Design a protein around this ligand. Structure first.
Ligand SMILES: *[C@@H]1O[C@H](CO)[C@@H](O[C@@H]2O[C@H](CO)[C@@H](O[C@@H]3O[C@H](CO)[C@@H](O)[C@H](O)[C@@H]3O)[C@H](O)[C@H]2NC(C)=O)[C@H](O)[C@H]1NC(C)=O
Ligand SMILES: *[C@@H]1O[C@H](CO)[C@@H](O[C@@H]2O[C@H](CO)[C@@H](O)[C@H](O)[C@H]2NC(C)=O)[C@H](O)[C@H]1NC(C)=O
Lengths: 49, 49
């Protein structure tokens, strides 16, 4: 018809928590961890050989 | 005084297995699986003669 309708629905729309795909963060690569040492055992053994 | 010996030790190699290393520091640049017909798929860098 042409009659207004009372809007009495108290909206409670709680948006769901969106998914998170946690990264595997890499701070120091293997090369840096191997190069962080002054004395490399492999090089010393190669020199001795 | 001349004495000949036969030492039996254990050698270790890591992937990609392009060199092994006995316990006495004998660093050998030969793949422990190079059988003489798969040089294309296994390293070999020691003296050829
Ligand atoms: C030296 O080692 C190499 C590998 O580094 C050997 O080559 C491989 O030999 C195996 C065993 O014969 C082959 O497998 C065969 O393959 C076919 C399917 O293609 C099948 O008919 C057989 O049942 C068998 O599994 C393999 O293909 C071959 N190549 C590679 C790249 O792995 C070689 O034979 C060794 N040589 C000696 C003298 O021991
Ligand atoms: C020798 O080994 C190399 C790599 O170790 C092989 O080269 C590969 O060849 C395949 C097939 O042609 C390619 O899909 C790869 O991308 C290649 N890899 C590299 C790193 O080049 C070569 O085929 C081998 N030779 C043989 C088996 O005769």
């Amino acid at each position: 018809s042409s009659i207004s309708t009372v809007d009495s629905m108290i909206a409670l729309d709680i948006d769901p928590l969106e998914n998170t795909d946690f990264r595997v963060l890499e701070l120091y690569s293997q090369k840096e961890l191997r190069s962080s040492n002054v004395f490399d055992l492999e090089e010393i053994m190669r020199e001795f050989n | 005084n001349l004495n000949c010996m036969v030492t039996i030790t254990t050698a270790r190699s890591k992937y990609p297995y392009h060199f092994f290393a006995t316990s006495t520091g004998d660093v050998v640049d030969i793949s422990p699986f190079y059988n003489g017909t798969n040089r294309n798929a296994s390293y070999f860098g020691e003296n050829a003669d």
